[PDB]
Structures are given as structure tokens and as C-alpha cells.
Amino acid sequence: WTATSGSCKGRCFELQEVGPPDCRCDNLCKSYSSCCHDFDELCLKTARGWECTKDRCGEVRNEENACHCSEDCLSRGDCCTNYQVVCKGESHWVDDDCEEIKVPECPAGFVRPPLIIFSVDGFRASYMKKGSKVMPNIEKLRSCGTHAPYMRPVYPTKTFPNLYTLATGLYPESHGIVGNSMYDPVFDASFHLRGREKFNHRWWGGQPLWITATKQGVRAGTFFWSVSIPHERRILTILQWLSLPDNERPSVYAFYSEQPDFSGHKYGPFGPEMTNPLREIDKTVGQLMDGLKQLRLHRCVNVIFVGDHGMEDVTCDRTEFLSNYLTNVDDITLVPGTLGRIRAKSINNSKYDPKTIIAALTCKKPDQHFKPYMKQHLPKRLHYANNRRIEDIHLLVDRRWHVARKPLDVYKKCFFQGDHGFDNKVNSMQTVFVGYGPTFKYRTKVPPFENIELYNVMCDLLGLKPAPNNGTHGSLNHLLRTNTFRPTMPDEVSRPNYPGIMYLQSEFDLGCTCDDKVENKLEELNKRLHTKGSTKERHLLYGRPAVLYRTSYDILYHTDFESGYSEIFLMPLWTSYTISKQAEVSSIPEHLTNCVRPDVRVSPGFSQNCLAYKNDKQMSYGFLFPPYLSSSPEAKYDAFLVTNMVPMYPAFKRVWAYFQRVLVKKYASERNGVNVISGPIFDYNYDGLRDTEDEIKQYVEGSSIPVPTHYYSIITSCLDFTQPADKCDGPLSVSSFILPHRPDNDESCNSSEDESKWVEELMKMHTARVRDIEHLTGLDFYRKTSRSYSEILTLKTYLHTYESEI
Numbered sequence: 001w002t003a004t005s006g007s008c009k010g011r012c013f014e015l016q017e018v019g020p021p022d023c024r025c026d027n028l029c030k031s032y033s034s035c036c037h038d039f040d041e042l043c044l045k046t047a048r049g050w051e052c053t054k055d056r057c058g059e060v061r062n063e064e065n066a067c068h069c070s071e072d073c074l075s076r077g078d079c080c081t082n083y084q085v086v087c088k089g090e091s092h093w094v095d096d097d098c099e100e101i102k103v104p105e106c107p108a109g110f111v112r113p114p115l116i117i118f119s120v121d122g123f124r125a126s127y128m129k130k131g132s133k134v135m136p137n138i139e140k141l142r143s144c145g146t147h148a149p150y151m152r153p154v155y156p157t158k159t160f161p162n163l164y165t166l167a168t169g170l171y172p173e174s175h176g177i178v179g180n181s182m183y184d185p186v187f188d189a190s191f192h193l194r195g196r197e198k199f200n201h202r203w204w205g206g207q208p209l210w211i212t213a214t215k216q217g218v219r220a221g222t223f224f225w226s227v228s229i230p231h232e233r234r235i236l237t238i239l240q241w242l243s244l245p246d247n248e249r250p251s252v253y254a255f256y257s258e259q260p261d262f263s264g265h266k267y268g269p270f271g272p273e274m275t276n277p278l279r280e281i282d283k284t285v286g287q288l289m290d291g292l293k294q295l296r297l298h299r300c301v302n303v304i305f306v307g308d309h310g311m312e313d314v315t316c317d318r319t320e321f322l323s324n325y326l327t328n329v330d331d332i333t334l335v336p337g338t339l340g341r342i343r344a345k346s347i348n349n350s351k352y353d354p355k356t357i358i359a360a361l362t363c364k365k366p367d368q369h370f371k372p373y374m375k376q377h378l379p380k381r382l383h384y385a386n387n388r389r390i391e392d393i394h395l396l397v398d399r400r401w402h403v404a405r406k407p408l409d410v411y412k413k414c415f416f417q418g419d420h421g422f423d424n425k426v427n428s429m430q431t432v433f434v435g436y437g438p439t440f441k442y443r444t445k446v447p448p449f450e451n452i453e454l455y456n457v458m459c460d461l462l463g464l465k466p467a468p469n470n471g472t473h474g475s476l477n478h479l480l481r482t483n484t485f486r487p488t489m490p491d492e493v494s495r496p497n498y499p500g501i502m503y504l505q506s507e508f509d510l511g512c513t514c515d516d517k518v519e520n521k522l523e524e525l526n527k528r529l530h531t532k533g534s535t536k537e538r539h540l541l542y543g544r545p546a547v548l549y550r551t552s553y554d555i556l557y558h559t560d561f562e563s564g565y566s567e568i569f570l571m572p573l574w575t576s577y578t579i580s581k582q583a584e585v586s587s588i589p590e591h592l593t594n595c596v597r598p599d600v601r602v603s604p605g606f607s608q609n610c611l612a613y614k615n616d617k618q619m620s621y622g623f624l625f626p627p628y629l630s631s632s633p634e635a636k637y638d639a640f641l642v643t644n645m646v647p648m649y650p651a652f653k654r655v656w657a658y659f660q661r662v663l664v665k666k667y668a669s670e671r672n673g674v675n676v677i678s679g680p681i682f683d684y685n686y687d688g689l690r691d692t693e694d695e696i697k698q699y700v701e702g703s704s705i706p707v708p709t710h711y712y713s714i715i716t717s718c719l720d721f722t723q724p725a726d727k728c729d730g731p732l733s734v735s736s737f738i739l740p741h742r743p744d745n746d747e748s749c750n751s752s753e754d755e756s757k758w759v760e761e762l763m764k765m766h767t768a769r770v771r772d773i774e775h776l777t778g779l780d781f782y783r784k785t786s787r788s789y790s791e792i793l794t795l796k797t798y799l800h801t802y803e804s805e806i
């Protein structure tokens with residue numbers, strides 16, 4: 001209950017929320033049906049519109065007008081944004097030549113340049129080029145400031161997950177806003193777009209920028225505007241707040257536009273009706289920039305123009321219905337649309353079984369437009385699993401499509417022509433970033449980056465210490481003229497051992513055999529050199545990875561490859577090798593088909609054994625350094641060492657063998673040599689972080705050999721592909737993947753066909769950042785290069801998406 005019978009006089013859009021429930025005049029009051037009776041009257045004035053006209057110039061203040069053209073309006077901070085232009089012969093900001101802002105040019109009493117966030121809903125990245133004719137203010141921001149060709153949203157590419165990711169630097173799985181709708185089984189509560197539960201704070205985890213600011217003594221404008229508050233009034237309020245006294249004035253502000261998303265849903269991303277919302281957004285930027293110029297703040301504030309996600313062409317007739325696949329349709333709850341999430345309709349039903357639901361949805365129709373996953377089998381790049389609000393069963397929906405439960409759900413809920421929510425690597429989902437101001441660079445294009453990175457930068461812009469988040473702090477230093485964050489490399493926690501030959505063959509009882517007893521100071525001094533690391537400069541190009549946790553491991557050197565071998569998990573944590581453009585693929589000789597060789601540098605007690613693989617009828621094994629790529633017949637023997645062996649399902653060996661036999665050589669040919677680092681990943685609790693030994697849920701039968709949940713590879717070459725990978729003088733180029741180590745190839749519907757038809761496609765789906773592999777392994781890569789560390793951080797955050805040109 002609010003006894004809403006006080007007044008908003010002199011309190012319009014007050015920055016602090018009041019008790020006793022006086023009645024409120026802040027930004028949230030409308031949402032809480034708690035505004036004072038006179039809120040609309042005093043705070044939402046509209047009389048005379050939003051622009052000065054020639055005849056209003058020098059008028060007598062009339063407090064009824066929405067904005068003012070009177071002589072005293074500058075001191076009051078409440079002129080119409082075009083005042084100086086119409087009344088004082090000034091030019092519009094957009095008409096001025098742009099001039100580098102080398103230092104902040106701020107009025108006295110400004111302790112730091114303010115940050116103004118101009119956020120636009122559904123602003124697809126290609127609008128920057130495609131609508132450029134109708135968006136002159138935005139186009140000047142972009143060409144004069146710093147801009148990316150696009151910015152990558154988080155999954156799902158919905159509004160609340162993305163706005164809150166922008167606010168926190170966290171993946172939705174960590175901040176808790178994992179969709180536009182959610183059920184939290186612990187709370188036993190539901191969250192929806194329409195309604196009041198969404199206002200309960202218990203949904204909103206992490207620490208958003210306004211809270212980070214406030215806790216550190218930096219005041220923030222409100223990050224909420226009621227839908228009904230017109231855009232002109234939002235801008236005038238921000239401009240009013242900027243005229244507050246030094247002790248009261250916020251340092252960070254947010255504007256938000258519901259457009260172009262709103263029209264995009266109705267007309268599609270490029271409907272002819274879309275021109276007008278883009279014009280109107282541009283005009284709103286113009287009003288802000290004219291207003292800032294009037295306050296002499298246009299060379300003082302940093303402005304960020306930023307979208308939450310893009311927009312795709314989606315119509316009613318492109319809907320897949322679960323009723324065409326499932327017989328038990330009424331025993332499930334589907335969260336529907338551009339993603340699907342399935343759970344049991346009732347928990348008092350023990351006849352509900354996720355595995356049969358998955359099986360009924362798997363590759364059932366030739367052109368099927370969604371793919372079911374258990375959430376832990378989703379591509380690791382999505383970081384979409386570690387939250388009780390994400391249902392175990394998930395549907396990734398093809399771009400341009402919807403999934404729904406039953407047809408009645410679609411015609412008794414074509415209206416819409418656009419939607420978003422799809423995989424965050426989809427081109428149509430990409431959004432925008434432009435930074436303009438004294439702290440951003442001048443006329444600079446930066447590479448595309450992920451929106452999880454912005455929180456750190458916004459904290460940098462405000463001199464704040466960021467809360468713990470998923471950005472990689474320093475990876476966006478190249479956006480900034482000053483205020484950069486000088487990251488330092490993490491310290492190695494475990495140093496390796498360098499074992500020499502310490503064991504005789506007969507000490508090993510591994511049930512392994514090799515036809516290798518086929519026999520010289522030429523070739524014997526040579527092999528000794530290789531075992532001591534003579535070729536290591538060739539196969540370990542960027543230094544050994546650092547181990548960032550406490551463990552026991554050995555460096556093992558070989559002619560063709562180097563490895564960091566874990567005595568704890570009984571296999572390498574990483575294996576490193578370089579394949580030049582000129583390298584030759586050979587086959588595994590017949591007599592060596594089943595060969596596994598004891599490693600006389602490593603104890604029987606810290607080795608795998610062959611018997612375990614014989615006994616385990618499900619599990620086979622593969623090698624990290626591929627025998628196919630051995631440099632000579634004698635070097636090939638190194639590849640069959642038990643210390644190069646890893647557990648692999650036969651279904652997965654089809655994927656791996658094709659990667660190692662065909663694709664590595666193809667990349668070496670295309671990129672002029674590649675360095676490859678490969679290894680296992682263990683993430684049984686699907687938190688995106690390296691498992692400790694006590695977290696492993698599966699072992700090779702009858703052994704302590706842990707089964708990986710994934711296999712990674714990091715493939716590095718020279719960005720200037722005229723230089724070979726092993727002799728690169730400049731920036732690097734990387735692509736990586738994290739493949740799920742699965743006992744079936746159910747994920748790939750074409751898997752009965754030859755590997756040339758489906759494997760590369762699977763690998764593309766499971767593309768990853770080096771940074772994702774760093775979290776999953778506790779390793780730190782690229783420690784010894786000739787590059788600056790900020791540049792390496794940017795490289796570690798790169799994702800090769802395989803989408804065509806935006």
C-alpha cells in the first residue's frame with residue numbers, strides 16, 4: 001500500500017528512492033503504482049513540444065512548457081536541445097567537422113568525464129551500413145569515434161539476458177537471467193516479461209555497473225525508463241541531471257530505446273517500415289549531442305552507442321511443433337520460440353524420462369529445424385548450463401524458425417515478421433558498438449568482440465574496480481586512448497619435472513605390446529638430443545603453457561612434439577606440435593596398428609595400461625600427437641608411447657582421426673604451417689571450469705584413468721600468412737575448438753556418411769576461444785611471444801565463427 005498523497009514538486013525524477021512512502025517521483029514509481037498524484041502534471045509536461053522555434057526565443061519562462069527557450073534556461077539546465085541553434089545562431093553537432101578530442105574539455109568541477117550509455121534494443125549490426133543514409137548523427141559518432149564492425153551478444157540473444165550481461169560482465173548462467181521467461185525450482189517461483197515477480201531482486205545476481213559505481217562513491221543516473229516516458233523527456237532528464245551541483249551530479253547515465261526492436265518484430269529486420277524508427281533514433285542522438293554541446297560537454301563526456309542483439313526474419317509458417325514428434329506432448333512444459341527449454345509438466349510423475357524425449361526429437365525429419373541437447377552437451381562457447389533455471393533439455397533452433405508445443409499455441413496465443421534469441425554466432429543476431437569521447441580513440445576501427453567485455457571497460461572509464469566477471473580485463477585496451485588496464489600474466493603455480501630415462505621395459509606390466517624390437521652414434525646421439533629438447537623451439541612456439549593450479553606433471557620432449565604429462569590424471573594436460581606447409585601425411589604401418597609402448601621416463605604406477613581398454617567394452621583410445629604426422633618412420637615410434645594415449649569412444653575416434661589425418665594438413669596448407677596444442681578437458685559439473693580429481697564421474701573400467709568430457713585443440717599461425725607459422729615476426733591468427741567426447745554421433749544427423757560430409761561441420765559448431773579452454777584446463781597459453789600482453793588477451797578472446805561476411 002502506498003498512500004500516494006504527497007507531491008512531486010521540485011522532485012521530478014529524483015535520484016534516490018524515498019521512505020516514508022511520501023509517494024515516489026523516481027524512475028521506478030510508475031512500475032510500482034506508487035507515483036505522487038501530480039507526477040504526470042509536473043514531471044511529464046509536453047506543452048509546446050520539444051523544439052524551440054524563432055518566435056519562442058527570449059520568451060518569458062512559462063513553467064508549463066516541456067522545455068524552455070527563455071534567456072535563463074541554460075542556468076536552469078532545461079532549454080530545448082535545439083535552443084542555441086534556433087535562438088543563438090549555433091550549428092547542430094552533426095554539422096560540425098569532427099576534431100580529435102585529445103583531452104577531456106570539461107567545465108570546472110567535473111572530477112572525471114561522465115559516461116553516457118545510449119542503448120538501443122534490436123539494433124542489428126548491419127543497420128550501421130544499411131541505414132547510414134538516414135542516420136547522420138550515429139554515422140558521425142561511428143566514423144569519428146571508435147567502432148567495431150559488430151559486437152557479439154550472449155546466448156540467448158534475448159533482451160533481458162543481454163542487457164544484464166552488459167550491466168555485469170557475466171554470462172547469463174552466472175547472473176541468473178537465462179531467458180525472457182524462467183522457473184526457479186528452489187524459489188518455486190516464475191519470472192516473466194509481463195508482471196511483478198521480475199521486480200523481485202532474487203532473480204538478479206552479480207553486481208551491475210550502477211551498484212559497482214555507488215559502492216565506490218560514484219553516483220549513477222537511473223537505469224530504468226518506463227515505456228510511456230517519451231524519448232525526448234528521457235534525454236531532457238539526463239541533461240538536467242548533468243546540470244546538478246558537483247556533489248549531486250551522477251557520473252554514469254543510461255538512455256534506452258525500445259526501437260528498433262519493437263518495429264522489427266512487426267515488420268522484420270529490413271521491412272520498409274524500419275526506415276522511420278531508425279530516423280527517429282538518430283534524431284534522439286542528435287538531441288543528446290546538441291544538448292551536450294549547449295552545456296559545453298560534447299568534448300567532455302564519453303558516449304557509448306550499444307545494442308543488446310539483432311533481429312532475424314521469422315514468420316508463423318516457420319514453426320516446428322513438438323506434437324509432430326512426441327506422443328506424450330501433454331506431460332511436458334515447453335519454453336517456446338527461438339529456443340526451446342523442456343521440463344516435466346509435473347514432478348510427481350516418475351514415468352517422465354528425458355532420454356526418450358531426446359531420442360524422439362533426434363534427427364526425425366529430413367529438414368528438421370531444431371536440434372535437441374542435454375544442456376551439458378551444448379557447445380561450450382554458449383556457456384549455457386550451470387544454472388538451476390536452465391532446463392536439462394534444450395533445443396537449439398535454426399535461424400529463421402520457431403519451435404512450439406502444439407499448433408493451438410501458435411494461432412490461439414501471422415502477426416510477427418521478426419524475432420531474435422538464436423545462437424549468438426548467427427550474423428543476424430550481431431549488434432553494434434561505438435565509443436565516442438576523450439577516453440576513446442579517434443577514427444579507429446577495432447575487431448568484433450563480445451559484450452561480456454564491456455563491463456570492465458565501463459569500470460575503467462569511471463575509475464572503478466570491476467566486480468569479478470567473465471570479461472578478460474585488458475582485452476579491450478585497444479579501444480582506449482587512456483585509462484587502460486595494465487594486466488600482468490598470472491604466476492605459474494606448479495613447476496614441471498623433467499624426467500630422464502628411469503625405468504627398464506620389464507618393470508612395466510601394462511598388457512601393451514609393440515612390434516618395435518627392430519634395430520650407431522649418428523642416429524643415437526641424435527635421438528638423445530630430441531629427448532632432451534633439441535627440437536623444442538620448433539614445436540613449442542609460444543612457450544610452454546603455465547599450470548595455474550597445484551599438481552604434479554612432467555615435461556616430455558620428442559622429435560615431433562612436446563607434452564606436459566599429468567601424473568594425477570595419467571595423460572597429457574597439453575601436447576604441442578608444429579606442422580609446416582611442406583609436411584607429409586603418412587599412414588600407420590600395418591605392423592604398428594595396435595602398438596602401445598611403455599615410456600621409460602614415467603613410472604608404471606603413473607602410466608595408463610592396455611588391459612583396462614581391452615576390458616572396457618565401451619572405451620577405446622586415441623593419441624594426442626597424431627602418428628599420421630610423424631616426421632620419419634623412426635620418429636613415428638614416439639607417437640605410440642603410452643604417455644601420448646588418451647581414452648576415446650569409438651564414435652569419437654571417427655571425429656578425431658579425421659581431424660588429425662585430414663584437417664590438420666589442410667590447415668597447414670591454407671595457413672602456411674600451423675602450431676597445434678591439443679588436450680583433454682574434464683568438466684563433469686558443466687561449470688565451464690577445470691574439474692578437480694574428486695569431481696570425475698567416469699573412469700576407464702577397472703582403472704584410475706579418468707574419461708575426458710571434451711577434447712580441445714588450439715591452432716595458431718601467422719596473421720601475415722606469407723610468413724610460415726614457425727618464423728612469424730608479427731601478430732598471430734588462432735582458431736580453437738572444444739569437441740564433446742560423446743559415445744555416439746547422434747548430434748550429427750549425417751554421421752552414417754563419410755567424415756568429409758559431417759566432421760568439419762561438427763567442429764565449426766564447437767568453435768571456442770582460447771580463453772574458454774584456459775578456464776576448462778587451468779592452463780595459461782602464449783606466455784612467450786614477441787607481442788604485447790593486451791594484444792595476446794585480445795587473441796585469447798577471439799572466436800572463429802565461420803559465418804560469412806556481415
Ligand SMILES: *[C@@H]1O[C@H](CO)[C@@H](O[C@@H]2O[C@H](CO)[C@@H](O[C@@H]3O[C@H](CO[C@H]4O[C@H](CO)[C@@H](O)[C@H](O[C@H]5O[C@H](CO)[C@@H](O)[C@H](O)[C@@H]5O[C@H]5O[C@H](CO)[C@@H](O)[C@H](O)[C@@H]5O)[C@@H]4O)[C@@H](O)[C@H](O[C@H]4O[C@H](CO)[C@@H](O)[C@H](O)[C@@H]4O[C@H]4O[C@H](CO)[C@@H](O)[C@H](O)[C@@H]4O)[C@@H]3O)[C@H](O)[C@H]2NC(C)=O)[C@H](O)[C@H]1NC(C)=O
Nearest residue numbers: 173174175176204205206386387388468469470687688775
Ligand atoms: C564467470 O565469472 C563469475 C564471477 O567470477 C564466476 O562465478 C563465480 O565462480 C566461483 C566458483 O564457482 C563462485 O565461488 C563460489 O561462491 C560461493 C558463494 O557465492 C555467493 O556469494 C557470491 C559473492 O557475493 C555471489 O556472487 C554468489 O551468487 C551466486 O548465487 C546466488 C544465489 O544462488 C545468485 O543470485 C547468483 O546469480 C550466483 O549464482 C551463480 O553461481 C552459483 C555458485 O555460487 C551457481 O550455483 C548458480 O548456478 C549461478 O551460476 C553467491 O551468492 C561459495 O560458497 C563457494 O564456496 C564453496 O567452494 C569453495 C571452493 O573454493 C570452498 O572453499 C567452500 O568451502 C565452499 O564449499 C562449500 O559449498 C559447496 C557447495 O554448496 C559444498 O559442496 C561444500 O561441501 C562446502 O560446504 C564458491 O566460492 C562464485 O560464487 C561465482 N560468482 C558468480 C557471480 O556467479 C564464473 O565461474 C565465471 N565463469 C566462467 C566460465 O569462467
Ligand SMILES: CCCc1nnnn1-c1cc(C(=O)NCc2cnc(C)cn2)cc(-c2ccc(C)cc2F)c1
Nearest residue numbers: 117119163164166167198199223224225254255256306
Ligand atoms: C527496460 C528498461 C531497460 C533500461 N532503461 N534504461 N536503462 N536500461 C538498462 C537496463 C539494464 C538492466 O539490465 N536492468 C536490470 C533490470 C531490468 N528490468 C528489471 C525489471 C529489473 N532489473 C541494462 C542496461 C545497460 C545497457 C547498456 C550497457 C552498456 C549497460 C547496461 F547496464 C540498461
Ligand SMILES: [Ca+2]
Nearest residue numbers: 613616619620
Ligand atoms: Ca575397449
Ligand SMILES: [Ca+2]
Nearest residue numbers: 683689690691
Ligand atoms: Ca567443472
Ligand SMILES: [Cl-]
Nearest residue numbers: 158179180181
Ligand atoms: Cl526465453
Ligand code: NA
Nearest residue numbers: 745746748751
Ligand atoms: Na548420427
Ligand SMILES: [Zn+2]
Nearest residue numbers: 122159261265
Ligand atoms: Zn525483441
